[PDB]
Scaffold this active site. Structure first.
Site, PDB file in Angstrom:
ATOM      1  N   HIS A   1       0.812  -1.219   0.000  1.00 57.14           N
ATOM      2  CA  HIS A   1       0.000   0.000   0.000  1.00 57.14           C
ATOM      3  C   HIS A   1       0.852   1.280   0.000  1.00 57.14           C
ATOM      4  O   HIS A   1       1.809   1.385   0.772  1.00 57.14           O
ATOM      5  CB  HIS A   1      -0.943  -0.024   1.213  1.00 57.14           C
ATOM      6  CG  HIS A   1      -1.994   1.044   1.205  1.00 57.14           C
ATOM      7  ND1 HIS A   1      -1.956   2.132   2.052  1.00 57.14           N
ATOM      8  CD2 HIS A   1      -3.123   1.180   0.469  1.00 57.14           C
ATOM      9  CE1 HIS A   1      -3.009   2.897   1.830  1.00 57.14           C
ATOM     10  NE2 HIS A   1      -3.732   2.343   0.873  1.00 57.14           N
TER      11      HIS A   1
HETATM   12  C1  LIG Z   1       4.531   9.372   6.993  1.00 62.23           C
HETATM   13  C2  LIG Z   1       4.067   7.945   7.017  1.00 62.23           C
HETATM   14  C3  LIG Z   1       3.984   7.238   5.821  1.00 62.23           C
HETATM   15  C4  LIG Z   1       3.557   5.909   5.820  1.00 62.23           C
HETATM   16  N1  LIG Z   1       3.481   5.219   4.626  1.00 62.23           N
HETATM   17  C5  LIG Z   1       3.064   3.901   4.601  1.00 62.23           C
HETATM   18  C6  LIG Z   1       2.986   3.216   3.390  1.00 62.23           C
HETATM   19  O1  LIG Z   1       3.290   3.769   2.335  1.00 62.23           O
HETATM   20  N2  LIG Z   1       2.565   1.903   3.362  1.00 62.23           N
HETATM   21  C7  LIG Z   1       2.220   1.260   4.535  1.00 62.23           C
HETATM   22  O2  LIG Z   1       1.847   0.087   4.492  1.00 62.23           O
HETATM   23  N3  LIG Z   1       2.296   1.933   5.743  1.00 62.23           N
HETATM   24  C8  LIG Z   1       2.714   3.255   5.788  1.00 62.23           C
HETATM   25  N4  LIG Z   1       2.787   3.942   6.996  1.00 62.23           N
HETATM   26  C9  LIG Z   1       2.371   3.266   8.277  1.00 62.23           C
HETATM   27  C10 LIG Z   1       0.861   3.019   8.333  1.00 62.23           C
HETATM   28  O3  LIG Z   1       0.163   4.233   8.163  1.00 62.23           O
HETATM   29  C11 LIG Z   1       0.485   2.338   9.647  1.00 62.23           C
HETATM   30  O4  LIG Z   1       1.198   1.118   9.716  1.00 62.23           O
HETATM   31  C12 LIG Z   1      -1.013   2.044   9.813  1.00 62.23           C
HETATM   32  O5  LIG Z   1      -1.768   3.238   9.830  1.00 62.23           O
HETATM   33  C13 LIG Z   1      -1.253   1.262  11.106  1.00 62.23           C
HETATM   34  O6  LIG Z   1      -2.620   1.135  11.427  1.00 62.23           O
HETATM   35  P1  LIG Z   1      -3.099   1.304  12.957  1.00 62.23           P
HETATM   36  O7  LIG Z   1      -4.604   1.146  13.033  1.00 62.23           O
HETATM   37  O8  LIG Z   1      -2.385   0.353  13.896  1.00 62.23           O
HETATM   38  O9  LIG Z   1      -2.713   2.827  13.316  1.00 62.23           O
HETATM   39  P2  LIG Z   1      -3.486   4.075  12.651  1.00 62.23           P
HETATM   40  O10 LIG Z   1      -3.969   3.781  11.243  1.00 62.23           O
HETATM   41  O11 LIG Z   1      -2.575   5.276  12.648  1.00 62.23           O
HETATM   42  O12 LIG Z   1      -4.705   4.317  13.682  1.00 62.23           O
HETATM   43  C14 LIG Z   1      -4.492   4.856  14.969  1.00 62.23           C
HETATM   44  C15 LIG Z   1      -5.643   5.783  15.345  1.00 62.23           C
HETATM   45  O13 LIG Z   1      -5.874   5.744  16.741  1.00 62.23           O
HETATM   46  C16 LIG Z   1      -6.245   7.033  17.190  1.00 62.23           C
HETATM   47  N5  LIG Z   1      -5.959   7.212  18.628  1.00 62.23           N
HETATM   48  C17 LIG Z   1      -4.781   7.616  19.205  1.00 62.23           C
HETATM   49  N6  LIG Z   1      -4.939   7.651  20.549  1.00 62.23           N
HETATM   50  C18 LIG Z   1      -6.204   7.276  20.845  1.00 62.23           C
HETATM   51  C19 LIG Z   1      -6.889   7.138  22.053  1.00 62.23           C
HETATM   52  N7  LIG Z   1      -6.334   7.547  23.192  1.00 62.23           N
HETATM   53  N8  LIG Z   1      -8.206   6.728  22.044  1.00 62.23           N
HETATM   54  C20 LIG Z   1      -8.842   6.457  20.846  1.00 62.23           C
HETATM   55  N9  LIG Z   1      -8.158   6.595  19.651  1.00 62.23           N
HETATM   56  C21 LIG Z   1      -6.858   6.998  19.646  1.00 62.23           C
HETATM   57  C22 LIG Z   1      -5.482   7.999  16.304  1.00 62.23           C
HETATM   58  O14 LIG Z   1      -6.196   9.210  16.165  1.00 62.23           O
HETATM   59  C23 LIG Z   1      -5.344   7.234  14.996  1.00 62.23           C
HETATM   60  O15 LIG Z   1      -6.274   7.681  14.035  1.00 62.23           O
HETATM   61  C24 LIG Z   1       3.212   5.270   7.015  1.00 62.23           C
HETATM   62  C25 LIG Z   1       3.296   5.984   8.212  1.00 62.23           C
HETATM   63  C26 LIG Z   1       3.720   7.313   8.217  1.00 62.23           C
HETATM   64  C27 LIG Z   1       3.801   8.038   9.530  1.00 62.23           C
HETATM   65 SB   LIG Z   2      -0.773   3.674   4.468  1.00 62.74          SB
END
Ligand SMILES: Cc1cc2nc3c(=O)[nH]c(=O)nc-3n(C[C@H](O)[C@H](O)[C@H](O)COP(=O)(O)OP(=O)(O)OC[C@H]3O[C@@H](n4cnc5c(N)ncnc54)[C@H](O)[C@@H]3O)c2cc1C
Ligand SMILES: [Sb+3]
Ligand SMILES: Cc1cc2nc3c(=O)[nH]c(=O)nc-3n(C[C@H](O)[C@H](O)[C@H](O)COP(=O)(O)OP(=O)(O)OC[C@H]3O[C@@H](n4cnc5c(N)ncnc54)[C@H](O)[C@@H]3O)c2cc1C
Ligand SMILES: NC(=O)C1=CN([C@@H]2O[C@@H](COP(=O)(O)OP(=O)(O)OC[C@@H]3O[C@@H](n4cnc5c(N)ncnc54)[C@@H](OP(=O)(O)O)[C@H]3O)[C@@H](O)[C@H]2O)C=CC1
Ligand SMILES: NC(=O)C1=CN([C@@H]2O[C@@H](COP(=O)(O)OP(=O)(O)OC[C@@H]3O[C@@H](n4cnc5c(N)ncnc54)[C@@H](OP(=O)(O)O)[C@H]3O)[C@@H](O)[C@H]2O)C=CC1
Ligand SMILES: [Sb+3]
Lengths: 485, 487
Positions: A460
């Site tokens: 992705h």
């Molecule tokens: C600049 C950048 C570029 C990236 N590019 C890629 C890429 O090209 N390809 C790829 O595979 N991955 C990429 N990633 C990583 C990818 O975005 C993450 O691996 C993915 O979003 C993980 O999913 P998640 O649900 O664990 O975290 P997230 O999708 O970030 O979800 C976490 C959510 O929890 C919320 N939250 C925080 N604290 C609390 C709380 N106290 N109570 C309730 N909610 C809360 C936040 O607001 C956030 O929206 C990138 C990351 C960054 C920073």
């Molecule tokens: Sb992503």
């Protein structure tokens, strides 16, 4: 016994592969006959074949050149400000740069022959005399002077294919894909006759390099271009060619062509209409190039349209004579002929014989946007398999919200056998499609199933990651019938 | 019994996958907690998570924008004549267009919740109270007002990860990947600290959007950027970033940062040097975001750096509490969390349990040019396998003879086990690499061998067709030792 082990007629994708292999990996005396060393209008094809000289290589260059029209337009949305109105490209500098690249490859092949012992290049028109004698003449005319007389163990025919004309009056006023590569100026008013690979790809080229107020028309005999391809892809491409400025015109066919006294050509059509184009290109077809080789003399069986009849190992009616590539008329592609050539060498000089696997060969069309397909269409798989499953998915890449080109939809369609899940066809339209389909073709060759696709974690963000998200079939075919379930 | 079946903390790539699935395919009452609905500087992340708001999605857009610098330069060779000298892009209109796209996705997630029965969005900071109580507060401060109190069967933690700072004096004068997305102007003098995914990708961005006479510096702690990747790819990328105008600077690290009285920042370095950058971005790392969730209270085991400790099915120290995505700190990627989420649903609400396959996951780096890899490097496979075979191939695509960009070399490196022929790693550098590696990752999941590659007929002309032409290994590893041939 004989002067050479192998005389190869045609220094093309097939010829050069077989020639080099026999001479280097097996140290055999190999004579390779062709028309000329460098690319050039009088005779077109040269060292490296159509692929290198008047085919794929320069084609791909000009496609890349045309693609910048879209890319310059698109950059605006991203903040790239520059003088865009009334801006057209320089055709002459493209053809210049194109010639430089092709010529350098021609040269690389000249020094290859000089540096490789066993290999030798023999310039002229090769023709058969008997099972062991290839006669190089200076002309296609079998009365021109005999330049050489090559005594050989094995004869390999790899002279490929040639543009088909159409019998209409004024036919010789039109150009083909050959002369297209050597036009002095880019045409303002272009007509591309036909609905095939060349027809489509070249429409995209001219449409990119058209001067001010220029336009490209594409007329096809039937009612949907690129017959043989996924029908849902064909329809979507027709739309996007339109949206890009190409006026597609189905169920239409020229009938007579005359020359106006300013250079231009007047075209009489099927529907009786008349229009004026600066040039008209005939992408009608490619008949195998064997009319000259005097196969009758050596007793080599030629079937439908001059194509040299061979078995699965490329062996002809005579045991020592072989044929590969477009001249056999199986699957007319460069990597196929290369694979046919490499197999041929393993067969007769390698000891361990081998046949080229013609099914599940991945190929591409370099239109704007490009097509990347492998395997079976709906129509065919339905009329060949008990129960099939058709998966589909269309989407606009997020960038195109900004880029402005909102017509650029990426399409994937996977066609499986419902009984076991085996992927029988993958069909893609959009940027990167040719690149993606390649590694796809490996899975198909590995007999992969739809379950293998959607169990692989995605990458992705890509257009390709969408291959692993198609879980539920859009619909089915139950023994020929288009069934909803 | 309980008000909800599932409270998901974090509406991210993992959160929204699990939430939606439980609610739609299984008809469960699902409450999803997150900080805000639309992307925005005060708190950054929103509906859709990092991926949608301050991560991948806007990143990929800006990379595409930057890539035009190369593409406009290159078009000249093909006949495209236009006023090129003194031409720089408009940053403001990029960020504008970027905001439009992200906001549009924020909105489609708002209406998703409104249209889906079972699903509900609950805005605030979720925190644990016990095995069955998630408490939504208005702040991370556990003394702020309690907005809701959600009684639930299952708790799913999917709050992801957060930029790490470095303890240096003046640390808080620097930006991170978050603030990068919301800069008012494109910086003339940029410093990108670190040698990781973000560091590299963003260097490419700023280098594309730099104004006249602008420059981007990239300083890394060690001596070769992107540690963990194919070392031959890393070296080739370092050169190409240089050739593209990015000044890579190894074995260097800032030590102190002060603010000049014109806005700019003064940076003191490792080698004791001093330079002036308009902005300095810290791509140091991403620690799991669990410091606030009061896991202690609910008794959820947090291991190394706050990461929530789970088994192969994402189950924590408590039976009803789960965690997915970056907060677990396995493979921090969007499609991984999505797969972890989809599996979680099948495990508890689907009846048929399932574990996310963490090995042989294909990923990409969106630098200019981009990296596309899958599986094992030389180093690792040599220190893990009896006898290995390393295949390599480099080439310049014929177009680049005309395009002018002769530095743009496409590289493929296949790493196999010599005993069987099995492909253990594929590593690619160059345009289209992310797209190609995807369908590659299918084959490696299908346990494909090098024999399967070079028996497939090629697609001519592509960069990808070269995967099927690598027949003879460039060299070998015989139980840890770099041997040139076999005995
Ligand atoms: C600049 C950048 C570029 C990236 N590019 C890629 C890429 O090209 N390809 C790829 O595979 N991955 C990429 N990633 C990583 C990818 O975005 C993450 O691996 C993915 O979003 C993980 O999913 P998640 O649900 O664990 O975290 P997230 O999708 O970030 O979800 C976490 C959510 O929890 C919320 N939250 C925080 N604290 C609390 C709380 N106290 N109570 C309730 N909610 C809360 C936040 O607001 C956030 O929206 C990138 C990351 C960054 C920073
Ligand atoms: Sb992503
Ligand atoms: C415009 C165009 C674009 C194409 N694009 C693609 C593409 O993108 N991808 C793809 O896979 N395929 C493409 N093809 C098809 C591809 O060029 C052929 O499939 C391939 O070249 C066939 O190899 P071959 O050795 O059989 O023939 P060739 O490569 O054409 O070699 C035949 C050679 O034999 C020589 N010859 C002819 N007569 C004699 C004789 N009398 N004596 C001695 N030598 C002789 C000719 O001069 C010629 O050089 C394209 C074709 C065209 C026309
Ligand atoms: N990217 C690639 O891989 C490329 C591959 N090639 C190879 O070479 C190609 C041959 O060239 P090309 O002719 O452009 O492709 P095709 O011969 O495959 O297709 C062109 C066809 O010509 C039209 N046509 C045929 N006869 C007539 C007629 N009498 N009057 C009007 N129109 C007619 C249409 O036929 P119909 O009505 O039956 O649909 C149209 O589909 C293919 O065979 C392909 O194998 C060529 C270029 C690129
Ligand atoms: N396209 C994609 O797939 C993307 C994925 N991601 C994900 O998020 C990433 C985390 O963010 P990111 O920081 O950019 O990447 P990483 O945490 O993986 O790597 C960046 C590292 O920062 C440097 N560094 C670490 N500690 C220090 C320190 N104390 N002082 C100075 N420099 C230091 C280098 O560490 P070192 O010395 O150990 O080599 C460098 O390797 C990855 O883990 C990845 O999983 C992020 C962006 C894009
Ligand atoms: Sb070719």
């Amino acid at each position: 016994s004989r002067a050479y082990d192998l005389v190869v007629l045609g220094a093309g994708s097939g010829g050069l592969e077989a020639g080099w292999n026999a001479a280097v990996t097996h140290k055999k005396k190999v004579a390779v006959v062709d028309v000329q060393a460098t690319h050039g209008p009088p005779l077109f094809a040269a060292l490296g074949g159509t692929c290198v000289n008047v085919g794929c290589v320069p084609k791909k260059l000009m496609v890349t050149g045309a693609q910048y029209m879209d890319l310059i337009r698109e950059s605006g949305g991203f903040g790239w400000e520059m003088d865009r109105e009334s801006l057209c490209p320089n055709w002459k500098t493209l053809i210049a740069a194109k010639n430089k690249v092709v010529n350098s490859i021609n040269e690389s092949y000249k020094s290859m022959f000089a540096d490789t012992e066993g290999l030798s290049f023999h310039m002229g028109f090769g023709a058969l005399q008997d099972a062991h004698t290839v006669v190089v003449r200076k002309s296609e005319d079998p009365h021109s002077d005999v330049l050489e007389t090559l005594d050989t163990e094995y004869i390999l025919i790899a002279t490929g294919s040639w543009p088909t004309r159409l019998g209409v009056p004024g036919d010789e006023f039109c150009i083909t894909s050959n002369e297209a590569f050597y036009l002095e100026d880019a045409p303002k008013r272009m007509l591309c006759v036909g609905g095939g690979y060349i027809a489509v790809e070249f429409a995209g080229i001219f449409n990119g390099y058209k001067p001010c107020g220029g336009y490209v028309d594409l007329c096809y005999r039937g009612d949907l271009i690129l017959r043989g391809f996924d029908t849902e892809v064909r329809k979507s491409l027709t739309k996007q060619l339109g949206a890009n400025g190409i006026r597609v015109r189905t169920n239409l066919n020229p009938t007579k062509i005359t020359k106006n006294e300013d250079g231009s050509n007047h075209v009489h059509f099927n529907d009786g209409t008349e229009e004026d184009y600066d040039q008209v290109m005939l992408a009608i077809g490619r008949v195998p190039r064997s009319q000259a080789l005097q196969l009758d003399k050596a007793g080599v069986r030629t079937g439908k349209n001059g194509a040299v009849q061979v078995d699965a190992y490329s062996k002809t009616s005579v045991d020592n004579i072989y044929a590969i590539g477009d001249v056999t008329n199986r699957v007319m592609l460069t990597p196929v002929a290369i694979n046919e050539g490499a197999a041929f060498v393993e067969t007769v000089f390698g000891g361990k014989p081998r046949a080229t696997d013609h099914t599940k060969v991945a190929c591409a069309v370099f239109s704007i946007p490009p097509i990347g397909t492998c395997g079976m269409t709906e129509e065919e798989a339905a009329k060949n398999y008990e129960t099939v499953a058709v998966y589909a998915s269309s989407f606009t890449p997020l960038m195109h919200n900004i880029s402005g080109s909102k017509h650029k939809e990426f399409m994937i369609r996977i066609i499986t056998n419902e009984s076991n899940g085996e992927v029988l066809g993958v069909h893609m339209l959009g940027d990167s499609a040719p690149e993606i389909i390649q590694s796809v073709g490996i899975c198909m060759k590995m007999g992969a199933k739809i379950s293998d696709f959607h169990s692989t974690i995605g990458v992705h963000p890509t257009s390709a990651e969408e291959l692993c998200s198609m879980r539920t079939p859009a619909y089915f075919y139950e023994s020929g019938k288009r069934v909803e379930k």
